[PDB]
Design a protein around this nucleic acid. Structure first.
Ligand SMILES: Nc1nc2ccccc2[nH]1
Ligand SMILES: [Mg+2]
Ligand SMILES: [Mg+2]
Ligand SMILES: [Mg+2]
Ligand SMILES: [Mg+2]
Ligand SMILES: [Mg+2]
Lengths: 239, 834, 334, 49
RNA sequence: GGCCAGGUAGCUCAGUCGGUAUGAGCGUCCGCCUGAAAAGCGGAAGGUCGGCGGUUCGAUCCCGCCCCUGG
């Protein structure tokens, strides 16, 4: 006979995925940082080597805070947390940040304007692309199983050089873009008081909504953010 | 935009000049472009077609009248002695035009087989095809008309149209503007495949035309940022001439429409070399040509016929009578080339990338020239591109190149356009990659991409070429070496992370709260940070309510929702309405997220130089200019709180369920809360509690106001709770309990109080008076019969007394109970029940 | 790599039981003096095959714990005998279950590493020792208050503890009636994950209660966490934007037919249109035959691509009625 | 008014302390092992010198 | 940005170029029925037809501006 007189509850799958991702990096010694969603233009663009009046900053659409030219915006990524961490913390730095990010995309089955991102930043002596690749492979193994294979290919981001994109191989089985990465640009280290001849670093950023989409095969991303209980309840209570 | 469209045949041709016989499959080319950093958005093969698809010439046209559309019966010469009768609904051709005919038995792209149909009372032996039906281009309004001389009737259609080709749709990153051309992409492939490269802009491919004098009087204001401005004329062009099919086809496959030889040549050389070019009608230029900033309120009519409001930072080309062009964005209608233009002045200019980017964005004109200039164009090929244009136009339009040339190259004239040299250690790419590359890898790769490399022991001096203004720092050179060697050779090595501290106390608290609410029957949702339209008006808030002092967004996706959330409740209530309106009427939602509460009008901070660390004063100044962003937990409840079952019909949501949510969050935060009656919209003023942790208020809970529920389309009895987690202090208690082995004493006390007296106040007074002997107190009865006075209530508490070192007598416990009764009498006016 | 899947599960089980009103204890591994004789266990009971101690602290308690219940029932007696009569305790600890007489392994030379065959020989000579979760309840399950007089503990509270553990383990359990001391044979459920038995739950036998001095109506749970496989499902829900159809069906079955069996048969027949099903009525009386019962389930139908007509839902309901007739002999209430 | 119909529950402090110790060491990269309480003398004394 | 085309009940939609949307399917309510339900039969309620103005004696419908979608 039914004995559960309590209604069925559930934590959101995106919150559960962020918690699993945070646990994955804390198990490797990393820590979890914070950051405000309304960020100054200095920390979202200027400190991240974004050139002024350049398509690197222009072609990227941004939610700007009124009035016009207020140097205030809704952060386009969790990358400003790299600036706040390198300014406040002592070296070496091994941090991840999970928060909401804001883009001007129309909400459909594969795009969402308001999503959650996982930013990673490691700054230390002698960090190379091999360490970035080692971190990316461990991240992908924790979220996609031991048989997960990744590939990095060159790309561009103003705050990294060299920059790259990360694909994952867990159609039925092919290369799907996961996130962006690269070595921290020496201008970013100089904008935070760090000697690029002494310290190197890498960074990466993955969307949580995108990660859950192909980790579970979820069709409509609109169900991820609209808040219908029919989407959360099948995932269980979650810890 | 950053799209680059080009057909493989053209790209293969430019590569093959230096690497004869070079040919790769489209799949391998896509992988190689990806492995070096070129996003391949689409790979579009042309056609395919099968069967009799041939070139024809329209030799007669009969107009079939009396239908829903003009219908033509056409006699088409297909190269044999029997002309074919074909019915066509298009009107974009005339007698003598060359067309593409699909005869019966042919198969067009999409599996469509062609056959002879009895249509419009006439015999149709095939069809005249449009570019869309052949999968050659997007045009479907009319049929495809080849320019005269493209082919003879009877030529194979697939060969003439080049349907064996494949169009690559590339997305070029803003740091590789040199790749917005066949020149750049072919050079990249030469690097990737270790090929010898022949630059299509070199003097061996574009031999310099004579320079016997100035081409036109020119004044340049160097403050406009212009780096080069060249002019060369072509006189006596034939207005009846049309571009050959090979030229119009390559433009079409690159996403550009053909118009006239003068414009076609400028667009073609733009795609081939990456240098935008423009053709002015020289006979419509009046006086000296001037390059200057626009003046306040100045306007200009671009060659599309639209008047453009200009700005003092826009760069213009002007003559004595009118504006000739918006520098690097679009030419004006005054000097545009028309159908009767016979003398042309070609313009090859290099504009300031920032000035063009600002102007084209403000004017909403992302032209093919604009997006190339804002990504920098190689200033060393300006005259080469100019000479390439003049010779091609003279050849195609039957004109003559004039041996005159104006070439402004700055004041004083600049002769070398190479960026400053860069010093870098020979093994620096190896250290950043974590890979031991073979000796000479760095020098070879940097010379491959066009830089000059000199060796000074272990230090390389690298001068990047003029078309690579992105190579400014050693990290830039590192990326060139790594991407050309391939990122796949970089091994996977775990970094030396130090011992961490784990999750902060606040991070663990959010997990415990979310876990406890979910286990208590709540469903978590992600709250949108944008407030719904006029929600505070629905709540009936005062105009000076602190929740209304929000932060607005200039360009929201919904113009009615620009403000940011000062409270999590509107997003939760919207999610509640979605659920209930779809059949899920018994729902309890919660959300843990931040809000945005500014304390002043939006104040921006100026630009701090990014070449140094900002001072601690500047860091604290940037933080104070941002609104406060505290962490909030909130929940909403409607419908049944206890589901129905064999036990009974269930229990509807009531305010006490919201108060219980407060207690769940409190127990999850290891703190004690006190609840006090309060008035705070949008809650019900008689069913609303203010939550306190110590003396600090942390939020509210209870049932929502009925007028708010009606105005908001909410279910009746909807309850809500919101707490500020940042206002709750983090606590880590260390209890040291000592279990008493002696028996307890059980006593109950019935106290009559006024109805307004809170039960917790009576309980706290009983605790205060009973002393240390009181081990437990629990309310188990609230009685309001007329035996109790009006507006009064009887409360019965179960008391449990226990001593730590002795067995109590009944008098011992009654002494503590009587002191508790006296304390309730003094603090809440309690009377012992008679 | 952090915590293993199992270690994470023991945390979630402990958190969920405490939030549900259970107090954790540390169970002692030493069995009370002839506790199984108090339970009335058979001489051949697998729990009686224990590992004994040469030098115990008390000469009458030298046996190791095969089950966590004797330690929890002991801690329950301490609480009740000291004035705390409404208790619910749980414990997550391993037990000891030898499969033979205590066998010894000869001395292996320390100057070298023992081969993997010598390691396996040392493991087989040890009891199995799996991780268990158990709980005991007595007195008031729901405390009294202004809402009412509270509810005494009943067997269904032990079954709800099973469902609390099962939800924390992210697995589905099925309960079947069973006889297994020290439980009441008419108030005992054997718990199954798939086809594997994982433990029992329900009310304790009244004779066992009286002979142990336990409170009347004491209930108990014990599950083998090692027999419950680890699961990490990856759901892919798709929320249908189309309206649902609500229907109820009343089915009459023999009294011995479990309500979950009827629910499973209705679900198997209703097909993919069935979005939710809940039992809200159990009715007996002379209107229904003797030793029979009527069950009414609330059904929610929804299509993923269309709005349903009432005939669409009734068709799925009739198929569910037919499936219940074939599986549990259900008869549509007339 | 009282709103908690669920009786008071609690996890044991020793389990809570073990959880806090375990979390402290996981955050440093360590892991958590397993061990039987009924142990052979080969593993409890002989192999430990 | 372009002229179109969509915005209509709680959900998914149909339909109207001036005085009723005789709106559909499902959702809500009532009666018969049942111990209590559901189905079934018989009935009801509920839209200010995206918002703000204008035209008109009257606007879902015609006009202007605006918000939200697809081409
Ligand atoms: N959000 C994000 N973060 C990044 C960090 C490095 C490279 C690319 C990135 N995109
Ligand atoms: Mg670069
Ligand atoms: Mg609608
Ligand atoms: Mg009815
Ligand atoms: Mg009806
Ligand atoms: Mg009606």
């Amino acid at each position: 006979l039914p004995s559960t007189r309590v209604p069925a509850g559930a934590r959101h799958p995106i919150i559960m995925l962020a918690e699993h991702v945070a646990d994955t990096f804390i198990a490797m010694g990393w820590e979890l940082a914070e950051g405000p969603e309304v960020e100054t233009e200095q920390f979202n663009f200027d400190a991240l080597n974004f050139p002024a009046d350049h398509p690197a900053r222009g072609e990227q659409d941004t939610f700007y805070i009124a009035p016009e030219d207020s140097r205030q915006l809704l952060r386009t990524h969790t990358s400003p947390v790299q600036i706040r961490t390198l300014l406040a913390r002592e070296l070496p730095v091994y941090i991840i940040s999970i928060g909401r990010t804001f883009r001007t995309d129309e909400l459909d089955a594969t795009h969402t304007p308001i999503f959650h991102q996982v930013e990673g930043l490691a700054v230390d002596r002698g960090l190379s692309m091999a360490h970035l690749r080692g971190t990316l492979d461990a991240f992908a193994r924790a979220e996609f199983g031991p048989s997960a294979r990744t590939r990095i290919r060159p790309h561009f981001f103003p705050f990294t050089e060299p920059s790259a994109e990360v694909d994952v191989w867990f159609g039925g089985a092919a290369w799907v873009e996961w996130g962006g990465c690269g070595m921290v640009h020496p201008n970013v280290l100089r904008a935070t008081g760090i000697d690029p001849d002494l310290y190197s670093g890498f960074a990466f950023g993955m969307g949580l909504e995108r990660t859950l989409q192909f980790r579970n095969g979820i069709p409509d991303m609109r169900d991820m953010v609209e808040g219908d209980v029919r989407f959360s309840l099948p995932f269980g209570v979650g810890a | 935009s950053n799209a680059m469209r080009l057909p493989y045949s053209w790209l293969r041709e430019v590569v093959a000049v230096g690497a004869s016989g070079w040919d790769v499959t489209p799949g391998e080319l896509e992988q190689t472009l990806l492995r070096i950093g070129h996003e391949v958005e689409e790979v579009i093969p042309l056609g395919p077609v099968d069967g009799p698809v041939t070139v024809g010439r329209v030799a007669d046209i009969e107009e079939l009248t009396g239908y829903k559309k003009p219908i033509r019966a056409c006699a088409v010469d297909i190269g044999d002695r029997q002309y074919r009768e074909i019915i066509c609904g298009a009107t974009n051709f005339a007698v003598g035009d060359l067309v593409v005919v699909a005869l019966p038995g042919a198969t067009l792209p999409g599996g469509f087989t062609i056959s002879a149909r009895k249509a419009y009372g006439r015999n149709s032996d095939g069809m005249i095809c449009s570019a869309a039906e052949l999968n050659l281009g997007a045009d479907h309004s009319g049929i495809l008309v080849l320019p005269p001389g493209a082919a003879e009737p009877g030529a194979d259609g697939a060969g003439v149209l080049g349907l064996d080709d494949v169009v690559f749709h590339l997305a070029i990153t803003p740091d590789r503007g040199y790749c917005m051309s066949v020149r750049g992409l072919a050079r990249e492939l030469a690097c990737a495949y270790d090929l010898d490269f022949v630059d299509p802009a070199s003097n061996s491919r574009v031999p310099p035309l004579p320079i016997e004098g100035p081409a036109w009087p020119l004044t340049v204001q160097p403050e406009t940022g212009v780096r080069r401005f060249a002019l060369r004329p072509v006189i006596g062009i034939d207005p009846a001439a049309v571009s050959p099919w090979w030229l119009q086809r390559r433009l079409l496959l690159c996403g550009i429409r053909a118009t006239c030889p003068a414009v076609d040549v400028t667009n073609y050389v733009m795609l081939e070399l990456g240098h935008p070019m423009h053709a002015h009608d020289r006979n419509r230029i009046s006086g000296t040509l001037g390059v200057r900033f626009a003046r306040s309120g100045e306007t200009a009519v671009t060659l599309d016929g639209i008047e453009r409001k200009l700005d003092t930072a826009d760069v213009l080309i002007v003559d004595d009578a009118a504006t000739a062009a918006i520098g690097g964005v679009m030419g004006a209608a005054s000097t545009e080339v028309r159908a009767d233009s016979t003398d042309v002045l070609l313009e090859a200019a290099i504009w300031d990338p920032a000035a063009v980017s600002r102007t084209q964005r403000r004017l909403h004109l992302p032209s093919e020239a604009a997006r190339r200039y804002e990504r920098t164009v190689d200033p060393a090929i300006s005259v080469a591109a100019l000479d390439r244009c003049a010779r091609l136009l003279a050849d195609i339009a039957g004109g003559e190149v004039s041996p005159t040339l104006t070439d402004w190259r700055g004041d004083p004239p600049c002769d070398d356009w190479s960026p400053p040299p860069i010093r870098m250690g020979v093994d620096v790419p190896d250290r950043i990659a974590g890979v031991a590359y073979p000796q000479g890898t760095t020098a070879r790769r940097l010379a491959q991409i066009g830089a000059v490399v000199t060796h000074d022991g272990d230090t390389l001096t690298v001068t990047p070429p003029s078309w690579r203004p992105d190579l400014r720092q050693p990290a830039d050179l590192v990326e060139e070496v790594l991407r050309l060697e391939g990122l796949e050779v970089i091994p996977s090595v775990l970094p030396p992370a130090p011992a961490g501290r784990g999750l902060t106390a606040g991070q663990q608290r959010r997990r415990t709260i979310g876990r406890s609410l979910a286990l208590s029957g709540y469903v978590e949702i992600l709250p949108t940070p944008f407030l719904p339209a006029g929600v505070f008006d629905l709540w009936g808030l005062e105009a000076d309510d602190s929740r209304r002092m929000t932060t607005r967004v200039l360009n929201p996706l919904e113009a009615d929702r620009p403000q940011l959330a000062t409270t999590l409740l509107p997003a939760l209530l919207e999610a509640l309405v979605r659920n209930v309106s779809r059949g899920l009427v018994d729902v309890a939602l919660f959300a843990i997220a931040q809000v945005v509460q500014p304390t002043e009008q939006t104040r921006g901070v100026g630009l701090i130089p990014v070449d140094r660390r900002p001072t601690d004063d500047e860091i604290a100044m940037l933080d104070a200019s941002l609104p406060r962003q505290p962490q909030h937990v909130a929940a909403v409840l409607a419908g049944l709180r206890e589901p129905r079952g064999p036990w009974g019909p269930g229990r509807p949501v009531e305010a006490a369920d919201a108060f219980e949510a407060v207690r769940i969050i409190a127990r999850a935060s290891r703190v004690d809360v006190t609840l006090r009656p309060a008035q705070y919209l949008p809650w019900h003023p008689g069913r609303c509690a203010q939550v306190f942790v110590g003396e600090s208020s942390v939020g509210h809970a209870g049932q929502l106001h009925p007028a708010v529920i009606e105005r908001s389309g909410l279910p009746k009895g909807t309850c809500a709770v919101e707490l500020n987690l940042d206002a709750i202090p983090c606590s880590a208690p260390l209890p040291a309990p000592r279990v008493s082995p002696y028996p307890a004493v059980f006593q109950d006390v019935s106290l009559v109080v006024a109805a307004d007296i809170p039960a917790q106040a009576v309980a706290d007074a009983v605790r205060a008076g009973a002393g240390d002997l009181l081990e437990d107190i629990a309310l188990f009865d609230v009685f309001t019969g007329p035996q109790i006075g009006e507006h009064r209530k009887s409360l019965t508490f179960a008391l449990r007394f226990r001593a730590p070192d002795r067995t109590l007598t009944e008098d011992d416990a009654s002494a503590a109970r009587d002191a508790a009764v006296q304390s309730a009498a003094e603090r809440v006016g309690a009377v012992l029940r008679g």
